[PDB]
Amino acid sequence: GISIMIKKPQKSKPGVFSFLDPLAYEIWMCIVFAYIGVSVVLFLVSRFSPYSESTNEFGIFNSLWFSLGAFMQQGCDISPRSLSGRIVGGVWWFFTLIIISSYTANLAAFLTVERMVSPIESAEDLSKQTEIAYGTLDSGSTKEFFRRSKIAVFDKMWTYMRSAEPSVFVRTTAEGVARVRKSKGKYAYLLESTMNEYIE
Amino acid sequence: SESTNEFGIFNSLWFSLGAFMQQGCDISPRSLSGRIVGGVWWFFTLIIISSYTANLAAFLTVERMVSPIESAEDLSKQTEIAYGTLDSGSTKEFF
Amino acid sequence: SESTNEFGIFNSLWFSLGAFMQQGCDISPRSLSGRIVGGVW
Amino acid sequence: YDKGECGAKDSGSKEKTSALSLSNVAGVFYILVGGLGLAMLVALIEFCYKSR
Amino acid sequence: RGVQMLLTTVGAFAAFSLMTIAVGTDYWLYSRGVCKEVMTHSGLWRTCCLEGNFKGLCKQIDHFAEYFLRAVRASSIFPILSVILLFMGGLCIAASEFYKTRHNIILSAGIFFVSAGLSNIIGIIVYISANAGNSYSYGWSFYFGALSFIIAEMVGVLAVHMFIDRHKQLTG
Amino acid sequence: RGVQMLLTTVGAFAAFSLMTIAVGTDYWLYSRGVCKEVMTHSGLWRTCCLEGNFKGLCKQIDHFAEYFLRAVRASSIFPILSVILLFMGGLCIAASEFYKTRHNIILSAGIFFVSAGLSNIIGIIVYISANAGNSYSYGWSFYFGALSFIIAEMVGVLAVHMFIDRHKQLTG
């Protein structure tokens, strides 16, 4: 019987650093600069004249530490006490929350969208997603069959091939399989099953 | 040259275990090399839990489950599922 | 007099703000009728 | 319809999304830098308004 | 101890020398473009076509609610203000021969360094949010700006530590 | 107190032995294939058929961007480093049976054991990551690959405890 040939899809090749993909490069670039800015401003506010070294434990090391810990949502050891640093602390925290939640949501969304995929199968769904091109040998009996038949799915497929452009028809089976291979998908070809399962 | 922090082995395990979950433990590294570790491990955890949550949210929507046997030929490479035919008929004689 | 907790208005504001964004603040209520407000929020 | 040259009823691109991008989040950086500005503005007072 | 005063000058010198080139070169962005349909490079101010016979065919750029951000991008003030504030910081660290033992100008230099450092972060955010309006990539002047920012935030901390070592150290 | 100098050695030699046995044996993985499909088992180096007339026949494996990781899998450099570091650690603790009271041999020995563990981790991770590009299951040499790490880190902790117990006890 008449049957359909497609390009074998291979298997995916996930990148080793795929985990950054749900969040564009400029975000990661700006995060480090904002981290530096906030840490340095909290140091500079933290060590004005006490007028005594005990006046503020926030030396520059501890400032960097507190900023990192605040961003990682894992707590810290010394919170800021001056209103000056209090406010920036709060703000930074807010920013952190926004980023975290956003990232998580985006990942979830991408996964769901990548698993609704439902690849083309059963050869009847081809009627709908006509962005995958398909055609037949020219002048052949398959063409006469599509012209002569009178069933709505085949009526639609015929009307498409009769109206779509550029030409989907080809001169030879070798030309057909060459066109399939060179299209690397997105084009499908019609021929008899006993020919199809030999090319395989 | 430093004999002042409480990082006994068991305490270190307790810190790590706490730091896997988000419950902020009391002790801190207090030194430089300790904070080098404490930084990275945090990031590890942050990414793992995130990913797991995402995948959980995902799988609970599509819910597509098929293919016990399907291939119509792999029905012989197992012995859990039984299979047979009408007796006395030509379907048996074929075998 | 009763002095089991030291919370001032500004301090309490800071505690509540921090507690909202889950950043592990230092002080706790440390008495009765404060644990309730800590848990609910 | 049957000599039309566009997807008349279904055109779902259903793309692998363009990832989240800085255009979507820039507001948070906008408020952040202003928070640092206010922080410095108050820091120029908190310890030193009693100078004389 | 003591000698780090040299490093304040070395840092401020490096930052100022980098930022003039960063603001003053036509190589912030590589993209496809036009110069009346080919690979192209653009600065903040002007755009030039290349990759062919038209090498160095150039025109001044045209930038034209969102209008107010577009006007902020078009006035482009924040990069230049970064240079202005580092220049003021240079005038501050020049205070070697006046108001000795006070060092308050030295402390103010740290403020000028920080406020300069903020300016490039604002600038980059505005610039990216404007270019979001391609398979593009960023030219070396972008890295020059980032490096000048890093050196700006480097030197202020050391200058304030020097203020501590020269003033707080006298308090006992 | 006291006896710790003994038990470090037996554990170190046990870990060394079980690790070199793990590296040397054909039972890392079970799967299906053909030696020239049938149930099949593989070591790191070689793959051999069972359950049929060809049983005990073996073949080499085709090793050949992912090309660099495949080259890492081929060289197996990380478990080799783990083996050699574990050997040198055992040599150190054996050497510490003489020229005593320097105590720094044990300090080096702990670092040897810990770094052999770190070298085992990356090896195992790369080995798994290279296959997961089938009803497989892991064989007992994979569990030896785990036990090497499990005992190695404990021996390293015991080594450092022995170091802090032998040294500076003269003043504390």
- What's the rounded Cα separation, in Å, for the pair E73 and E67? 10
Question: A44 near E114, Cβ under 8 Å?
Answer: yes
Structure tokens at A152: 């709505």
Spell out which chain C residues touch chain A, with contact meaning CB-CB distance below 8 angstroms: 10, 14, 17-18, 21-26
Tell me how many residue pairs between chain A and chain C have CB atoms under 8 A apart. Answer: 23
Strands A2-5 and E38-42: unpaired
Asked if A190 and A4 touch (Cβ cutoff 8 Å), the reply is yes
β-bridge mates for residue E48, sequence order = E41, E58
Report CB contact under 8 Å: A75, C24: yes
Chain A neighbours, 3+ Cβ pairs < 8 A: B, C, D, E, F
Q: Which residues pair with A134 in a beta bridge?
A: A188
Task: Collect all residues from A whose CB is shorter than 8 A from any CB in C.
Answer: 70, 73, 75-76, 79, 83, 86, 89-90, 93-94, 96-97
Give the sign of the dihedral formed by CA F32, CA F37, CA F38, CA F43.
Answer: negative
Phi, psi of F43 (to 5 degrees): -90, -165
Strands (E), chain F: 29-33, 38-42, 47-49, 58-59, 137-138
CA atoms E154, E156, E157, E163: torsion sign: positive
Q: How far apart are CA B42 and CA B29, in angstroms?
A: 13
Please tell me if residue A33 touches chain E, with a CB cutoff of 8 Å.
Answer: yes
Question: Any idea which residue has 């505005």 for tokens?
Answer: E126
Query: Strand F47-49 to strand F58-59: parallel, antiparallel, or no bridges (unpaired)?
Result: antiparallel
Give CA separation, A139 vs A147, A159, A188, in Å.
11, 16, 18
Residue C5 Rama label (left phi>0; alpha psi -120 to 50; beta): beta
DSSP state of E32: E
Among F162, F149, F145, F165, smallest CA distance to F25 is for: F145
Q: Distance between CA atoms of E122 and D34, rounded to whole angstroms? A: 10
**Contact in structure between E31 and E142 (CB atoms under 8 Å):** no
The 8 Å CB, 24+ separation contacts for A183-187 are: A183/A7, A183/A133, A184/A7, A185/A6, A185/A7, A185/A9, A185/A132, A186/A131, A186/A132, A186/A133, A187/A132, A187/A133, A187/A134, A187/A135
d(CA B83, CA B74): 12
Q: How far is CA E116 from CA A33, E17, E95, in A?
A: 13, 14, 19
Task: Check CB contact under 8 Å for C26 and A94.
Answer: no
Contact A93 C24 (CB under 8 A): no
F137: helix, coil or strand?
strand
Helix (H) or strand (E) holding F143: helix F140-166
Query: In this structure, are residues F12 and F93 in contact, taking their beta carbons and an 8 Å threshold?
Result: yes
Residues A191 and A2 sit within 8 Å (Cβ to Cβ): yes
| F40 burial via Cβ count (<10 Å: 0-12, 13-18, 19+) | buried
A4 DSSP 8-state letter: E
Sole residue written with tokens 């400029």: A26
Which class for D20: exposed (0-12), middle (13-18), buried (19 or more C-beta within 10 A)? buried
Which among F85, B88, D32, E25 is positioned nearest to A42, based on CA atoms?
D32
Interface A-E, measured as beta-carbon pairs within 8 A, has a size of 35
Q: Does A36 touch chain E (CB under 8 A)?
A: yes
Closest by Cα among D17, D16, D13, D18 to A131: D13
Residues in Cβ contact with D19 at an 8 Å cutoff, skipping those fewer than 6 apart:
A21, A22, A23, A24, A106
Q: Report the gap between the CA of E107 and the closest CA in chain D (Å).
A: 12
Interface residue D43 vs chain E (CB under 8 A): no
The H or E element containing residue A2 is strand A2-5
Please tell me the number of Cα atoms within 13 Å of A187 on its side-chain side.
18
CA angle F135, F136, F139 (to 5 degrees): 145
Pairwise CA distance, residues E61 & E43, whole Å = 9
How open is the CA angle D25-D30-D31, to the nearest 5 degrees? 105
Residues of chain A contacting residue B19, judged by C-beta atoms under 8 Å apart: 74
3-state secondary structure chain D: CCCCCCCCCCCCCCCCCCCECHHHCHHHHHHHHHHHHHHHHHHHHHCCCCCC
Distance, CA of C5 to CA of C25 (rounded, Å): 15
- Chain-centroid distance, C-alpha E167: 30
Report the C-alpha gap between F29 and F51 in whole angstroms: 15
The alpha carbon of residue D30 is apart from the nearest alpha carbon of chain A, in Å, by: 11
D16: left (phi over 0), alpha (psi -120 to 50) or beta: beta
| φ/ψ (deg, to 5) at E159 | -65, -40
Measured between beta carbons, the chain E residues lying within 8 angstroms of A49 are: 167-168
Encoded tokens for F96: 């510490």
**How far A23 CA lies from chain B's nearest CA (Å)?**
13
**Do β-strands A187-192 and F47-49 pair in parallel, antiparallel, or remain unpaired?**
unpaired
**Are A67 and A92 contacting, i.e. CB atoms less than 8 angstroms apart?**
yes
Give the CA radius of gyration of chain F: 20
How many Å from the N-terminal Cα to the C-terminal Cα in chain F? Answer: 14
Q: Across the interface, do A49 and D14 touch by the CB < 8 Å criterion? A: no
Sign of the alpha-carbon torsion through E51, E54, E58, E64: negative
Per the DSSP assignment, residues forming a β-bridge with F49 are F40
Tokens of F144: 């030896």
CB-hemisphere CA count at 13 Å for A109? 16
CB contact under 8 Å between F66 and A11, yes or no, is: no
CA E92 – CA E94 distance, rounded (Å): 5
CA distances (Å), origin E46, targets A27, E25, E29, E58, F41: 27, 10, 11, 7, 66
Q: Which residues contact A18 (CB under 8 A, 6 or more apart)?
A: none
Q: Residue E122's closest CA among E63, E60, E80, E164? A: E80
Does the CA dihedral F14-F17-F23-F25 come out positive or negative? negative
Give the span between the Cα atoms of A92 and A99, in whole angstroms: 11
Q: CA A112, A113, A116, A119 torsion: positive or negative? A: negative
Using the structure block, give the residue that is written with the tokens 């566009």.
D6
- Map tokens 């709505």 to a residue: A152
F55: which DSSP letter?
T
A3 neighbors A194 (Cβ within 8 angstroms): no
* Cβ within 8 Å of residue A184, ≥6 positions away: A7
- CB-based burial, E90-105: b 16+ in 10 Å, e otherwise: bebbebeeeeeeebeb
Contact call for residues A78 and A62 (beta carbons, < 8 A):
yes
* Gap between the Cα atoms of A75 and B46, Å rounded: 13
E101: left (phi over 0), alpha (psi -120 to 50) or beta: left
Rounded Cα–Cα distance for residues E111 and E92 (Å):
10
Query: Please, what's the largest Cα pairwise distance for chain F?
Result: 71
Q: Which of A49, A52, A56, A95 has the most E C-beta neighbours within 10 Å, making it the best mutation to test the interface with E? A: A49
**Dihedral in degrees, nearest 10, Cα atoms E16, E21, E22, E28:** 180
CA-to-CA separations, A197 to A1, A126, A192, B56, F54, in angstroms, rounded: 11, 20, 9, 40, 32
* Structural contact between residues F86 and F156, judged by C-beta atoms closer than 8 angstroms: no
CA pair distance E97, E120, nearest whole angstrom: 31
**Sign of the C-alpha dihedral computed for residues E115, E121, E126 and E131 taken in this order:** positive
> C-alpha distances in angstroms, B43 versus A69, A123, B56?
10, 47, 20
Spatial contact of A5 and A170, defined as CB atoms under 8 Å apart: no
Angle, helices A60-71 vs A25-46, to 10°: value is 140
Amino acid at E3: V
* d(C-alpha A3, C-alpha A142), whole Å: 11
Non-local (6+) Cβ contacts of A40 within 8 A are: A63, E114, E117, E153, E156, E157
Q: Classify strands A133-136 and A187-192 as parallel, antiparallel or unpaired.
A: parallel
Give the list of residues 6+ apart from residue A139 with CB closer than 8 angstroms, or none: none
Half-sphere exposure of F156 (CA within 13 A, CB side): 20
Place of tokens 């009996």: A141
Cis peptide before A166 (omega within 30 of 0): yes
* C-alpha E76: how far from chain center: 12
- Are residues B42 and A74 in contact, defined by beta-carbon separation less than 8 angstroms? yes
Q: Are E54 and E115 in contact (CB under 8 A)?
A: no
The CA-atom distances, in angstroms, between B36 and each of B29, B41, E168, F156 are: 9, 9, 31, 21
Which chain D residues are closer than 8 Å to E128 by Cβ? 22
Contact E58, E160 (CB under 8 A): no
If you ran DSSP here, which 8-state letter would residue E4 be given? T
**Encoded tokens for A27:** 């975000």
| Cβ–Cβ gap D40/E128 under 8 Å | no
Which residues lie closer than 8 Å to A24 by C-beta, 6 or more apart? D19, D20, D21, D22
DSSP letter for A125, please: G
Least Cα separation, residue A176 to chain E (angstroms):
34
Nearest to E122 by CA among D34, C15, A198: D34
A16: chain F residues, CB-CB within 8 Å: 69
**What span, in angstroms and rounded, lies between the C-alpha atoms of F148 and F19?**
6
Q: Which helix (H) or strand (E) holds B42?
A: helix B32-62
Q: Give the DSSP per-residue string, F78-113.
A: HHHHHHHHHHHHHHHHHHTTSSTT--HHHHHHHHHH
Beta bridge partners of E40: E31, E49
Nearest-angstrom CA–CA distance, A96 and A31: 10
Resolution of this entry, Å: 4.2
Q: Which residues of D touch E156 (CB under 8 A)?
A: none
Helix H or strand E encompassing E29: strand E29-33
Minimal CA separation from A198 to chain B, in Å: 20
Among chain F residues, the shortest Cα distance to A17 is held by: F65
Q: Which residues of B are annotated as a binding site?
A: 90-91
> How, if at all, do strands E57-60 and F38-42 pair?
unpaired
**Cβ–Cβ under 8 Å, residues E121 and A33:** yes
Binding residues of B for L-glutamate: 90-91
From the CB coordinates, do chains B and D have 3 or more pairs under 8 Å? Answer: no
Cβ proximity of B39 and A68 under 8 Å: yes
The answer to whether the beta carbons of residues D35 and A91 sit under 8 Å apart is yes
Q: Compute the nearest-CA separation of D36 from chain E (Å).
A: 9
- Per-residue burial over A13-25, b = 16 or more CB atoms within 10 Å of its CB, e = otherwise: eeeeeeeeebbbe
